[PDB]
Design a protein around this ligand. Sequence first.
Ligand code: MEW
Ligand code: NI
Ligand code: NI
Length: 330
Amino acid sequence: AGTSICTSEEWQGLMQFTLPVRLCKEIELFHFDIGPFENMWPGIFVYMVHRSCGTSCFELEKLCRFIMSVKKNYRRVPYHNWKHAVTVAHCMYAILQNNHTLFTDLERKGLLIACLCHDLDHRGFSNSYLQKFDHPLAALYSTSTMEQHHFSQTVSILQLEGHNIFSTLSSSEYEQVLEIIRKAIIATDLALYFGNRKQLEEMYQTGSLNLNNQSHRDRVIGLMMTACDLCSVTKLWPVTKLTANDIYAEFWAEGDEMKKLGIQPIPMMDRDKKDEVPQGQLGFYNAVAIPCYTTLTQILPPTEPLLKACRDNLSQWEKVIRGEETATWI
Ligand SMILES: Cc1nc2ccccc2c(=O)[nH]1
Ligand code: NI
Ligand code: NI
């Protein structure tokens, strides 16, 4: 109930945080894994906003309040949590740095914030579940149910006293950035990814894609959001494999709930069907991840390292299926 608010201790702490010098270089690379640096995660986000958008883009006190309240409105779920938010924000930073001048100052600030906020107040349940069992959220938000909720949570946080990092924008720029953020969060609904990627692929192959056309820009930003949201598949294999354990922990918890409601879950969500997981990952990489990064690389050539890493991880899942896995830790 209600929107959680960080403490004075929390945001003042972030304000005075300084990032270890060695990490500056690392944070620029697509393959950077925030995993080993938990205490630094909020500071890593400040650093990225300051590098991309400038140290004067946001009032520092309001930014620190905003970040630490965002952290507080992520739940202690296995995957759709604070760590995931920062991971997705980092991928976006890396995409923006490599493509900086394709995007406006307003788009860059909106997108970094959209990524940090995009799974706010996630409960560990899928759209499929909410709609199957008529949760109140599915009544309010007939499609893209959780994503409309995450956007609503973002606006709630901005509305807290001293949290509105966008207030200094002109009235027109303020409306524009909230729309950038709304569209970007909604785009993280994978249901919409399939149509979006197909359209972009067609616009690319026929040469009609035009980034001066707002509807095209919106679709490109959409695919960037998918690429950032799925970016665990673009890390080094051990990192990718550990994250997949967290993703499946959520899925199996949801399948357990469906069993109590008299419905057998899809195999992916069935903890008694773990043998099917490697084939399931193959299906997901083939149907979602590989096409996404393929089209993104076509439109934005500097993102190629995401595609190469995704392909390397597909190969690893294939090795699993063939029985060639070596020792793994969890
Ligand atoms: C099935 C599935 N696998 C994933 C692997 C990595 C990142 C995200 C996902 C996901 O959303 N679904
Ligand atoms: Ni989501
Ligand atoms: Ni997400």
